[PDB]
Structures are given as structure tokens and as C-alpha cells.
């Protein structure tokens, strides 16, 4: 009565903290906002996070709910 | 407006003198009067709510708000969000004029009157009770009722204790039993 | 009233302590008050018997370490998982 | 509950300034008095400020707390920013409805050569 599963969506982190990226490069594919867009980083309709500027990826935890935020500082 | 003035000149002073309160802004003051009509059986007869609403208007010109079922529950063969009651929030001039419409020209006219119970301050100074027959308000005549309909009244206060609720109303006479 | 003879530990971690128990000794520790913790090594057979009389867990014991004396009380104890022995004990300089 | 309701109502508009790097014009209103400041995108140093608690433009007001008073406060912040060099900002009404006094302060700021 079983016998089913779903195809893997290849999510996870594509660019980690400390990596040079251009603008538009995808950094994380996600379902919810496990990670949030921080300063100079943008959010697409499926919560895919992408670079809005050339620079290096930076993971930090900020604010009162200890959420993970990803930003990009220009280099 | 008559009962807001009478509260200040005499009751403020008196209430200070029970527990010997230090500040005039600490004496509980009557804030608001809220009327509600629980219809409950409007789900079968949809018009019973319409006839309930107009009842409140003559008691308190203020057009009533209709309260929804919130939780669906088959335990009463009901829907959710379908109207099942109505409410009116009184403050300022009308609240004081409505309060008048209650003791002076209704209470002498209560059915089998010997006084009301005094144990029902839920524990924090707010008072709640009910009346069975709404023809006791004189804007409501007897020749104009399509129903033996009624309505609970609950008052809300700034007293912090049950003791501080009894002294505030006592100072407004209030029949008590 | 009980007096325990102890030597100071020269090593630390799982290897030495399993080696200690492999050498029929076992570690314990002294902490409390303003002074620093004191890593010690004890002879196994002596403390097993001592703590078999309730007096051990409620009296002030005396530890003799390098011929001095630290006054402590038993505070916590790790016992062997299923054998009648001891893995570690906490003493507090109370 | 009175004060806390307004602070939450304003937060969303403030995060956009954080994302955008915007310089915001922050208003605080009280029944007794109205206040206007100018804060940098970093949020912690005020480049310009002006209010009714200041003796200059405040005694010359009928009540330090009406639409005209708000209008007096509004007039002062726009120019003062000019006296330093700050000119394009965005208005952060800090959760008050944009309406009574709050609109007088904003209208006065625009009239006196401020782009927002």
C-alpha cells in the first residue's frame, strides 16, 4: 500500500560564509526562512536567497529570535 | 450625565473613607457598561437575531454589534462565523444615562423583587448578572414585543479586589440582597 | 573523621582515567570557595569501603595530599555502571 | 495597553530603511508635546533634531502640542537639515496614524525645501 517517495530538490547551502560571489548567484535554497536575507541580500518567491551585490557571503545571527541572516559585504 | 456629576462630589470622597485611600486617582471608577443578547437559537430561525438587535436600540440608541460563533462545534449543530448574539459598548454620556435607565425606572419594576444577589464579582471587582424580561426599560412598550426575549448585562471596573467592587456599587445605592 | 590519602594528577582525560582504573586507582576532584580546583588520584579499594557506611556522605572527611590537609565533603559520586566500584567522585571545599 | 501597540505598527517601515540604507525622519507625539529628530541609516547618531521642549520655538506657540505646534516643529527640522547639508529623507511616522499633527509636521517640512 506504500511504495512512494519524492525526488530530492537539491536544496542546502550553495555558497558558504567566506566565499566570493557575483550578483545574482544563489546562496541558499530553502523551504521556510530557516535563513534570512540580511543587509545587501535578496529573497525570491520560494525563499531562495541570492546575492544583490558582488562580494563575500557572511552568516550572522542577529535580533531577538536568534535567526540566521545571510548578507554580503563588498570586497 | 446626571450620574457622572453625582459620582464626583460625593462618592469619590466617601470611597476614600472606607479603606482610607491616599490618592484620588486610586479609587475605582466606573469605566464602561456592556450589553449583550445571547440568541443561540437563531441558526434555525434566522430572523430572531434581527428582532434582538432592534430591542437594544431603544434601550441604548447605539446600533448593536453582532458576535460570531468562532469555534465550529457539532455539539450544538452550528456552523462557524454565523451570528449567534449581539453586543453594545457604552461609555461617557450614554453610559451614565443608561445606568440611570436601570436602577430608577426598571428596578422598582423588577419581577418578584426582593433585591439582587451580591456574590458574583468573579474575584476581580467586575460584576455580571441577567434579566429575564426586557419590557422593564420604558423606551420599550408592551404592545410592541414579538417575543419573550431577554439579555445579560456585565459591568467592568477598575477595582483590583472583590471588596473594592462592593464598596463602589454600595456607594451608588444599588439594591443588593 | 575519615582520612583519605591522595596524590596530585600529572595527566587528565579519558585515557589516563581509564588507565588509572586499569591501574586499580580512580580519579576524583576537589573544588569550592575561592581557591582553584585540585585534580587528584585515589587508591580505589580504600574509598569503596569507606563509603559503605552512611557516615561518609554526611561527615567532613580529611584529604591528605602531599602531606598537607584539605577539608572537604563528598558532593557527587559516579559509580561504576554495574559493578561494585567507583569511576569518579566530587568533593567540595565546604 | 496603549504605548506598545504603536511601536509594533511602525517596525515594518523601519526595516525597509535598514535594507535600503535610508536616512529616516522620526516623529514622536505625546498628548503634552510633539517631537521631531533626524537619524542616520545606522540608527544611533542624530544629525539634526528639533522639538517643543526647546525654549526657542515653543513659547511662541499657543500650545506646545497642537497642529500649528506640530507645524512649527515641522518647519524647523527641514531648514536645520539644510543648515548642516542633509536634504533627501523618508518620513517614519513611528506608528502614529499619518493624520492630525503628524501631517502638519510633514507638510511643513516639504514646503520648506525638503525632498521626501
Amino acid at each position: 500500500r506504500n511504495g512512494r517517495d519524492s525526488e530530492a530538490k537539491r536544496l542546502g547551502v550553495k555558497r558558504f560564509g567566506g566565499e566570493s560571489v557575483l550578483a545574482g548567484s544563489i546562496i541558499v535554497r530553502q523551504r521556510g526562512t530557516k535563513f534570512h536575507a540580511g543587509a545587501n541580500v535578496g529573497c525570491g518567491r520560494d525563499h531562495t536567497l541570492f546575492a544583490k551585490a558582488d562580494g563575500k557571503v557572511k552568516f550572522e545571527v542577529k535580533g531577538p529570535k536568534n535567526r540566521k541572516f545571510i548578507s554580503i559585504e563588498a570586497e | 450625565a446626571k450620574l457622572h456629576d453625582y459620582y464626583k462630589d460625593e462618592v469619590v470622597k466617601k470611597l476614600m473613607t472606607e479603606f482610607n485611600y491616599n490618592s484620588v486617582m486610586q479609587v475605582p471608577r466606573v469605566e464602561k457598561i456592556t450589553l449583550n443578547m445571547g440568541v443561540g437559537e437563531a441558526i434555525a430561525d434566522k430572523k430572531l437575531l434581527d428582532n434582538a438587535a432592534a430591542d437594544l436600540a431603544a434601550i441604548s440608541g447605539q446600533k448593536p454589534l453582532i458576535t460570531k460563533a468562532r469555534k465550529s462545534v457539532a455539539g450544538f449543530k452550528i456552523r462557524q462565523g454565523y451570528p449567534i448574539g449581539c453586543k453594545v459598548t457604552l461609555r461617557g454620556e450614554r453610559m451614565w444615562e443608561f445606568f440611570e435607565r436601570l436602577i430608577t425606572i426598571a428596578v422598582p419594576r423588577i419581577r418578584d423583587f426582593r433585591g439582587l444577589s451580591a456574590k458574583s464579582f468573579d474575584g476581580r471587582g467586575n460584576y455580571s448578572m441577567g434579566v429575564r424580561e426586557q419590557i422593564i426599560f420604558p423606551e420599550i412598550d408592551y404592545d410592541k414585543v414579538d417575543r419573550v426575549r431577554g439579555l445579560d448585562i456585565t459591568i467592568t471596573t477598575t477595582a483590583k479586589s472583590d471588596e473594592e467592587g462592593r464598596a463602589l456599587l454600595a456607594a451608588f445605592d444599588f439594591p443588593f440582597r | 573523621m575519615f582520612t583519605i590519602n591522595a596524590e596530585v594528577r600529572k595527566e587528565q582525560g579519558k585515557g589516563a582515567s581509564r588507565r588509572l582504573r586499569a591501574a586499580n586507582k580512580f580519579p576524583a576532584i576537589i573544588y569550592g570557595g575561592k581557591e582553584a580546583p585540585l585534580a587528584i588520584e585515589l587508591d580505589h579499594d580504600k574509598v569503596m569501603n569507606m563509603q559503605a557506611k552512611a557516615e561518609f556522605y554526611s561527615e567532613v572527611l580529611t584529604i591528605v595530599v602531599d602531606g598537607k590537609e584539605i577539608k572537604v565533603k563528598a558532593q557527587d559520586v559516579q559509580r561504576h555502571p554495574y559493578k561494585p566500584k567507583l569511576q569518579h567522585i566530587d568533593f567540595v571545599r565546604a | 495597553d496603549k504605548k506598545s501597540a504603536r511601536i509594533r505598527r511602525a517596525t515594518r517601515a523601519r526595516r525597509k530603511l535598514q535594507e535600503l540604507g535610508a536616512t529616516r525622519l522620526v516623529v514622536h507625539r505625546t498628548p503634552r508635546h510633539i517631537y521631531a529628530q533626524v537619524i542616520a541609516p545606522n540608527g544611533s547618531e542624530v544629525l539634526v533634531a528639533a522639538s517643543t521642549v526647546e525654549k526657542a520655538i515653543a513659547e511662541q506657540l499657543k500650545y506646545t502640542g497642537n497642529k500649528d505646534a506640530a507645524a512649527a516643529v515641522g518647519k524647523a527640522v527641514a531648514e536645520r537639515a539644510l543648515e548642516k547639508g542633509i536634504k533627501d529623507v523618508s518620513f517614519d511616522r513611528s506608528g502614529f496614524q499619518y493624520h492630525g499633527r503628524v501631517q502638519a509636521l510633514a507638510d511643513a517640512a516639504r514646503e520648506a525645501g525638503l525632498q521626501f
Binding site: - | - | 552512611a54 561518609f56 556522605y57 563528598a74 559520586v77 559509580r79 555502571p81 554495574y82 | -
Partner: protein, 136 residues
């Protein structure tokens, strides 16, 4: 026979029985029966062993059972081809690691608890030992 009344799932990955036990001091009574060897207790074994101590003590003394089946064991019956799905639940076991207090007792003299818990050890599939309450 002890058994979970309900579980989220009928069937369970085999899993393992690594590591050491958490239930290692006598926490309710005065004396205890402790697991030494490692393994799985069926619900029928736990019941047979629980009976032995109750025969021996008459309707005296209180007994606590510290382990609980919780783990479902499946089997494929005879004459079945491999594959074609996981077996049907037949009985229930608890995973035991050395050191788990299995049974405790208090309300009899120590000498009788050792005898009473002992007339149980012959029912268990793992070696056991008698343990006592200990100060601290």
C-alpha cells in the same frame, strides 16, 4: 502482558543496542534487580519474571518495573518469500543495556528480596545482579 497501548507507528527499523544504560541507582524502593548482560526483553519474559517475585512475597511488598517494552518486533511467518514487505507485529520488547535497574522492591527484609528477586533471574535472557539503595 505489558505493551504500549498505542504508538505512532506499528513497525520500527531494527536499530541497535549500543552504549550504556541510564537507570543505574535504586530510585524508588530499597533494593533492586539490575541488568548486567545486554539485550532485549520480551513482554512475556517480563511478565513471567514479575510473577516469580509475587508468588514468593504473598500479597506483601511493593514492586516497581523500571523497563518498558516500547519496541515492536516483527516476523515473517513460515513459507514466505523474502522481500514483499515488513512483517506483522507479533510481540513487544524493551532494549536493555548493562546497568538498567529492572525491578525494585521494598517492604521485605533484604535477605528475602535477594531470594525473591533471585527466583526471577532464571526467567531472564541476560545475567542479572542484586543491588541495594545507597546513600547519595
Amino acid at each position: 502482558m505489558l505493551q504500549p497501548k498505542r504508538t505512532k507507528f506499528r513497525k520500527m527499523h531494527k536499530g541497535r543496542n549500543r552504549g550504556l544504560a541510564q537507570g543505574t541507582d535504586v530510585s524508588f524502593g530499597s533494593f533492586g534487580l539490575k541488568a548486567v548482560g545486554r539485550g532485549r526483553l520480551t513482554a512475556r519474559q517480563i511478565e513471567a519474571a514479575r510473577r516469580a517475585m509475587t508468588r514468593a512475597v504473598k500479597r506483601q511488598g511493593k514492586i516497581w518495573i523500571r523497563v518498558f517494552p516500547d519496541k515492536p518486533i516483527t516476523e515473517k511467518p513460515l513459507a514466505v518469500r523474502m522481500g514483499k514487505g515488513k512483517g506483522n507485529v507479533e510481540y513487544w520488547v524493551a532494549l536493555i543495556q548493562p546497568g538498567k535497574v529492572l525491578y525494585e522492591m521494598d517492604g521485605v527484609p533484604e535477605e528475602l528480596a535477594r531470594e525473591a528477586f533471585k527466583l526471577a533471574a532464571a526467567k531472564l535472557p541476560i545475567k542479572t545482579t542484586f543491588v541495594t539503595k545507597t546513600v547519595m
